[PDB]
Write a protein that binds this DNA or RNA. Structure first.
Lengths: 271, 99, 77, 149
RNA sequence: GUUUAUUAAAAACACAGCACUGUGCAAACACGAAAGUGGACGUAUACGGUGUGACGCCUGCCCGGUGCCGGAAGGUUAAU
C-alpha cells in the first residue's frame, strides 16, 4: 500500500511510494510483448510538436486485449503484471481452451478469480457485456464508443462510468469528467472499477523521478525572452499581459471545443 | 439453517412468467438443502403507490428454511432479474403454516 | 493534385486587394468534390474528382460521353 | 434536366410525365436505382412510342408479379425458433439475415433489403408483425411469434 | 543539478509539490496550402497550457477598467 520513505536524504525525504505484494515478481509473458520505441515528441518532420517529452526508461509494449472478442468461454486469472505504459496493473488471464491474454485488472480481482465474456455471462466484476444487460445505476469501465471499436472510456487506474439512463437504443453515461453522454447500447463494457486505486497517492519526491518517468523540464513564460514566448522580457519580473500559450491562443479560460459533428451525443457539458 | 419470509412482487402483465420461476426458486433451495414451507400466491392486486408507474403488482409469498448463502445468491438474482420489482427477505423464528 | 478531372480547373493565383489596395498574393481554389457516379453501361459506381461546374457538365451531356473524352485525355476514372 | 419516367412514381410522376425537379434528386435516387431518365432531347424519341406503349404494361404486369411474390408464402406467418434467454430477455437479438434464412426456408425468396422489421429488432419473446417490401405500395402480412428454447 | 563554448555559475533556470484552465478521444494543442504524423498504440487518477516553487502557519477586501465565460428579448449590423 501507500508507505512513506524515511528521510535519510532529500530525494528519499519526500517520497511516498505505493508498494504492492500482488504484482508478479518476474519477467512478463513473452508473446504478448513487442518493442515500443520512445518518440521524444517528434513527428515525421522531426520537429518537436509536443514539448516536455523524452528521455526516461526504455519500455516494452504489452499488447492488451480491450476488444474481448472471445465470447461464451470461461477464463481464470493467472497473475497480475505491472504495465509501464498505463496507470493500472494488468492481469494475465488464461482461458479454458488454452489462450493467455492481457486484460485491464479491475478493483476486485485476485489470482484464481473467474471471468467470462459474451452477452450471457453474469454481472460479476470482470465480465464483459453489451450495455443492454448492465442495469441502470451500475458502475462500469472500459467502455466502447463504437460497436466493435475496442473500448475507449474509463481506462485509467480507479476510474468508473455510472450508467445513468436508457432511451431506446441509447444509454446515457455519466462520465468521470462530469460530462453526460449518449452511447450506443450495443457497445461492450466491462463491469466494476479499474484497479490500482491508490495511484494518485504517489508524490515522486525528487526531480529524477519525473525525469525518468519520461518528462523533460518545463520552462516558465516569464523567464523566456519576448521572441520565445509572449510573456517574455521585463526588467525583473513584469508580467502585464493576459496569459497565453506560446502560439497566441489565450490560455486559462478560453473554450475550444471545435468538433461540431459529435454534439448530438452530449447531454450535458462538464461543469 | 434459518427461516425467511421472502415476499416479492412482479409486473402486472408477467403473471404468465411468475410460476416456473418459483419452480427454479424451488431449484434455488431444495437443490442445496432448502425446505420450502409455504407457497401462498396473493396474485395481482392493487398498490397504494405506483412503483415504476403501475398499480396492481403481483404479490408472491414464499417461506423457506435454508442456508444463508444460497439466499445471498438469491438476492444477487433478485437485484438483476428485471421482472421482480420489490423484494424483501425477513428472518423469522420458525417455519409457519397458515395464511 | 487539386485538379478537376472532367473540366480541368487548375488552382489559379491572384492578388488580394484590401480597402487600402494593399496587394497580398493569394490562391484561388476550385470547388473540388469527390463523387461516386453510376454508369449503366459499366453498370457500376466510379469515383471522380469534379467541381460543381463539372457536375453540371455531367448533368447536361451523358456520362458515357465524358468518360470517353477522359479516355481521350488518357486520364484515370 | 426535367425527367422521363419509368415506374409509376412514389410521388412526383405517373409513368410518362415530365416534371422539372432538383438535380440532386435526379442523381442520387432517381437515376441509379433505375426509375427515371433525364430525357436529354432524344429519350423523348425513345419514349414517344418505343417505351410508353411496350415497357409500361410490361412494368405493370411485373407489378402483378410482385403481387405474386407476396402470394409466394401461402401462410403469411413465421415462428422463428432461435435460442433465447431465461424467462424473457433473449439470448441474442434475432436478425434480418436470420429471418431472411427463415423465410427463404419455405416461402418467399425476397431480398434482405426488401425485408423490413417495423417493430424494431424484436427484443422480447412474444407477438410481433413483420412485413415484406414486395412493392412500393403493397406489402406482406407476416406474423412472428419467437419461442424461447 | 543546469546556464552566458571564449570576461558574468549566481539570489538566475529547473525541480518534487500546489492551484487555475482547456481537453469525451477523428481529444485540445503542434508540424504540416494537403495527405498524414506527434499527442498515444495513451483515454480524465490521463494529456496540453499558465502561474508559484519542498516542508510549517497560511493566502484578506474590490468585478469599476481590459480579458474571459454564460444569456440574447431589444438597438446597431455584411454578402445575397
Amino acid at each position: 500500500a501507500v508507505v512513506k520513505c524515511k528521510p535519510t536524504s532529500p530525494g528519499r525525504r519526500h517520497v511516498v511510494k505505493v508498494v504492492n505484494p500482488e504484482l508478479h515478481k518476474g519477467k512478463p509473458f513473452a508473446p504478448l510483448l513487442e518493442k515500443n520505441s520512445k518518440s521524444g515528441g517528434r513527428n515525421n518532420n522531426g520537429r518537436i510538436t509536443t514539448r516536455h517529452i523524452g528521455g526516461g526508461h526504455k519500455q516494452a509494449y504489452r499488447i492488451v486485449d480491450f476488444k474481448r472478442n472471445k465470447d461464451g468461454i470461461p477464463a481464470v486469472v493467472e497473475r497480475l503484471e505491472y504495465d509501464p505504459n498505463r496507470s493500472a496493473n494488468i492481469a494475465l488471464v488464461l482461458y479454458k481452451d488454452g489462450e493467455r491474454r492481457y486484460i485491464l485488472a479491475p478493483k476486485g480481482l485476485k489470482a484464481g478469480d473467474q471471468i467470462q465474456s459474451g452477452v450471457d455471462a453474469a454481472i460479476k466484476p470482470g465480465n464483459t457485456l453489451p450495455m443492454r444487460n448492465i442495469p441502470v445505476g451500475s458502475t462500469v469501465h472500459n467502455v466502447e464508443m463504437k460497436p466493435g471499436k475496442g473500448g475507449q472510456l474509463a481506462r485509467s487506474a480507479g476510474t468508473y462510468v455510472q450508467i445513468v439512463a436508457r432511451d431506446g437504443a441509447y444509454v446515457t453515461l455519466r462520465l468521470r469528467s462530469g460530462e453526460m453522454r449518449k452511447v450506443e447500447a450495443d457497445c461492450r463494457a466491462t463491469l466494476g472499477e479499474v484497479g490500482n486505486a491508490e495511484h494518485m497517492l504517489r508524490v515522486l519526491g525528487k526531480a529524477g523521478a519525473a525525469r525518468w518517468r519520461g518528462v523533460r523540464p518545463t520552462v516558465r513564460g516569464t523567464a523566456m525572452n519576448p521572441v520565445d514566448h509572449p510573456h517574455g522580457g521585463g526588467e525583473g519580473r513584469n508580467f502585464g499581459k493576459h496569459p497565453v500559450t506560446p502560439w497566441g491562443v489565450q490560455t486559462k479560460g478560453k473554450k475550444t471545443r471545435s468538433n461540431k459533428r459529435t454534439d448530438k451525443f452530449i447531454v450535458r457539458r462538464r461543469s | 439453517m434459518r427461516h425467511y419470509e421472502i415476499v416479492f412482487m412482479v409486473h402486472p402483465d408477467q403473471s404468465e412468467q411468475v410460476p416456473g420461476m418459483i419452480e427454479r426458486y424451488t431449484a434455488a433451495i431444495t437443490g442445496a438443502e432448502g425446505k420450502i414451507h409455504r407457497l401462498e400466491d396473493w396474485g395481482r392486486r392493487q398498490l397504494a403507490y405506483p412503483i415504476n408507474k403501475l398499480h396492481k403488482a403481483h404479490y408472491v409469498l414464499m417461506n423457506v428454511e435454508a442456508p444463508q448463502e444460497v439466499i445471498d445468491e438469491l438476492e444477487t438474482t433478485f437485484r438483476f432479474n428485471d421482472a421482480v420489482i420489490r423484494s424483501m427477505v425477513m428472518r423469522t423464528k420458525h417455519a409457519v403454516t397458515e395464511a | 493534385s487539386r485538379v478537376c478531372q472532367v473540366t480541368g480547373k487548375r488552382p489559379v493565383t491572384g492578388n488580394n486587394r484590401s480597402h487600402a489596395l494593399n496587394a497580398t498574393k493569394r490562391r484561388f481554389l476550385p470547388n473540388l468534390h469527390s463523387h461516386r457516379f453510376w454508369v449503366e453501361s459499366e453498370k457500376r459506381f466510379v469515383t471522380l474528382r469534379v467541381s460543381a461546374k463539372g457536375m453540371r457538365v455531367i448533368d447536361k451531356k451523358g456520362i458515357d460521353t465524358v468518360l470517353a473524352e477522359l479516355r481521350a485525355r488518357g486520364e484515370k476514372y | 434536366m426535367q425527367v422521363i419516367l419509368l415506374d409509376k412514381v412514389a410521388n412526383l410522376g405517373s409513368l410518362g410525365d415530365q416534371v422539372n425537379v432538383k438535380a440532386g434528386y435526379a442523381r442520387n435516387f432517381l437515376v441509379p436505382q433505375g426509375k427515371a431518365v433525364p430525357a436529354t432531347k432524344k429519350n423523348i424519341e425513345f419514349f414517344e412510342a418505343r417505351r410508353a406503349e411496350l415497357e409500361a404494361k410490361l412494368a405493370e404486369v411485373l407489378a402483378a408479379a410482385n403481387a405474386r411474390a407476396e402470394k409466394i408464402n401461402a401462410l403469411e406467418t413465421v415462428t422463428i425458433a432461435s435460442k433465447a434467454g431465461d424467462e424473457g430477455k433473449l439470448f441474442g437479438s434475432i436478425g434480418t439475415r436470420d429471418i431472411a434464412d427463415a423465410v427463404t426456408a419455405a416461402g418467399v425468396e425476397v431480398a434482405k433489403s426488401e425485408v423490413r422489421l417495423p417493430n424494431g429488432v424484436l427484443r422480447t419473446t412474444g407477438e410481433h408483425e413483420v412485413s415484406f417490401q414486395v412493392h412500393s405500395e403493397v406489402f406482406a402480412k407476416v406474423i412472428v411469434n419467437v419461442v424461447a428454447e
